[PDB]
Design a binder for this molecule. Structure first.
Ligand code: CL
Ligand code: CL
Ligand code: CL
Ligand code: CL
Lengths: 10, 108, 107, 8
């Protein structure tokens, strides 16, 4: 996995 | 500031807060966005924890008391300490209809 | 240091204003800007321009830029009241050397 | 509700 900015709507 | 006896003093302030909120799911979910996780770019400082990034206005989380920037600590008795982003996603997706979360809130 | 065996709060920097200078590379500054008057604030109710993502290595990191910095001036053009896109255009036409003033806080 | 972010 890459250390990236992550965002998810729930 | 505050004023008392012609002295300008620092007002009483809430620095940190821990709140327990209960969101009710609707068609389309809980009306929030979560960001961060262990192994993801921090959302604030060096904190790889889970934080609320978006709160749909007048939505389920808005009516439950959630505020953008809150750190998500527990969901229905399951703590997210050290959880990766996607682990939190599935946790919030499987929390059921009533999603009771304990959050941590800062001042500004 | 201690006071009657009781720890003393260390010296703290609450906020600072830095003047940085980015040297553009590949035609980009290696940062992301978010916010603007008439847009959803990046922090609290402050509608100013805020550096959101400082690319690893690259121009801004070597210059000192950091995430959360509020951009105040760019080559003498003040950003007070700038909309996001007016801030974008300012930073795109800033030329090779882009001298920035920023306001930084502690978290 | 205009969230705007750009890469310069
Ligand atoms: Cl925030
Ligand atoms: Cl809980
Ligand atoms: Cl759960
Ligand atoms: Cl300047």
């Amino acid at each position: 996995r890459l250390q990236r900015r992550r965002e998810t709507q729930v | 500031f505050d004023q008392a006896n012609n002295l300008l003093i620092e007002p009483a302030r809430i620095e940190e807060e821990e709140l327990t909120l209960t969101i009710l799911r609707q068609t389309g979910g809980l009306g929030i966005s979560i960001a961060g996780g262990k192994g993801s770019t921090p959302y604030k400082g060096d904190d790889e924890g889970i934080f609320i990034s978006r709160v749909s206005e007048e939505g389920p989380a808005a009516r439950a008391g959630v505020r953008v920037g809150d750190k998500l600590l527990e969901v229905n008795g399951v703590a997210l300490q050290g959880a990766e982003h996607h682990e939190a996603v599935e946790a919030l997706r499987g929390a059921g209809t009533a999603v009771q979360m304990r959050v941590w809130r800062e001042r500004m």
